[PDB]
Amino acid sequence: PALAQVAVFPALSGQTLVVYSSLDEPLATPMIEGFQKANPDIAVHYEDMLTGEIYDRIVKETDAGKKTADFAFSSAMDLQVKLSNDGYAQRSDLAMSARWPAWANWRNTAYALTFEPAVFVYHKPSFTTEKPPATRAEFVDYLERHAKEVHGRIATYDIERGVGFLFMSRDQEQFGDIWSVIKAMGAAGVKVYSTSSAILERVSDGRFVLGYNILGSYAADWASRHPDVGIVLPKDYTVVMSRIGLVPEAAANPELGRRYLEFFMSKEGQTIMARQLQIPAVSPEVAGENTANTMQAIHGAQLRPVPVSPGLMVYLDQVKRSRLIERWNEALRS
Numbered sequence: 001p002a003l004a005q006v007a008v009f010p011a012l013s014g015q016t017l018v019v020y021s022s023l024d025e026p027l028a029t030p031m032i033e034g035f036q037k038a039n040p041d042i043a044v045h046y047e048d049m050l051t052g053e054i055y056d057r058i059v060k061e062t063d064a065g066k067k068t069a070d071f072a073f074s075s076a077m078d079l080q081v082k083l084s085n086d087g088y089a090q091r092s093d094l095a096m097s098a099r100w101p102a103w104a105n106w107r108n109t110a111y112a113l114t115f116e117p118a119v120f121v122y123h124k125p126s127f128t129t130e131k132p133p134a135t136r137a138e139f140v141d142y143l144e145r146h147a148k149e150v151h152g153r154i155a156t157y158d159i160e161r162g163v164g165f166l167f168m169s170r171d172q173e174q175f176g177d178i179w180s181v182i183k184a185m186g187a188a189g190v191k192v193y194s195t196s197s198a199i200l201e202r203v204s205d206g207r208f209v210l211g212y213n214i215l216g217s218y219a220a221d222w223a224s225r226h227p228d229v230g231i232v233l234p235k236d237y238t239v240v241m242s243r244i245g246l247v248p249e250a251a252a253n254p255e256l257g258r259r260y261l262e263f264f265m266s267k268e269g270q271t272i273m274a275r276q277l278q279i280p281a282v283s284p285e286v287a288g289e290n291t292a293n294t295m296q297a298i299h300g301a302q303l304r305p306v307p308v309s310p311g312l313m314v315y316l317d318q319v320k321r322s323r324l325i326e327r328w329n330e331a332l333r334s
């Protein structure tokens with residue numbers, strides 16, 4: 001089945017915006033509240049769903065001649081650019097469009113809105129006589145040196161079930177020998193999940209000792225409430241994604257969709273992300289440590305972000321996508 005956690009926010013004043021988003025609802029709530037305070041006559045129908053489902057649903061609904069979401073917001077950058085390339089989005093010519101960083105804008109249609117790293121997470125109580133691995137080489141070595149302790153107690157994204165796939169496809173482009181890492185994880189009996197939150201809950205209470213390619217923003221959110229979750233930005237390289245927002249062609253209320261997009265692009269909206277949600281901002285109007293500018297300044301070539309402006313060519317086609325997934329299953333089982 002196709003799943004969604006739906007949350008409906010009535011107009012503050014006493015028109016409903018429909019959002020399909022992969023941003024976990026509790027972290028989304030401050031953005032929703034900010035939008036609603038700015039727009040007291042707008043109800044918000046927020047559907048929290050997997051990135052692959054955002055894609056599938058928009059394609060299915062649009063193809064069916066039906067209406068679809070007014071705003072699609074997804075960490076599966078490739079699937080968002082594909083929708084936009086195949087005619088499932090519509091152009092949004094807005095206030096901040098021309099000044100939006102060029103890398104973060106495909107044809108005033110798909111906009112990259114955040115700057116979020118894929119990180120290691122660890123159970124702090126489990127790393128008391130040795131510090132956790134900080135590179136992929138160290139990760140593999142740790143797994144080997146602690147074969148029995150780690151076995152079935154590490155986790156990563158099930159790339160078959162979209163941000164996981166993105167991160168793997170980027171790992172393959174940096175790291176020639178990513179497959180040694182995948183193989184090592186399979187020998188350690190790696191468990192795979194569709195969400196960072198599932199992995200974070202299990203690392204938090206020590207069921208798992210390590211997670212790989214976890215969303216750093218979510219990890220920082222967890223760690224702020226659960227002191228036993230530690231985070232390592234990998235020192236060999238750190239893949240960075242950006243959540244992409246667009247207004248579907250078949251939006252019932254494209255105007256409300258564009259309003260929400262404008263809010264997400266605004267100084268106010270981007271400051272809520274940076275300052276409240278531990279999601280680093282892309283807006284050239286926002287200063288501070290939780291920004292793409294400062295992160296690039298501090299970390300440099302360690303960071304491996306993904307550009308939007310070249311379009312679909314940056315990303316793997318459907319058949320190569322399928323091939324990479326069967327290779328990944330092949331490595332985890334070898």
Ligand SMILES: [Mg+2]
Nearest residue numbers: 022023024195
């Ligand atoms: Mg999510």
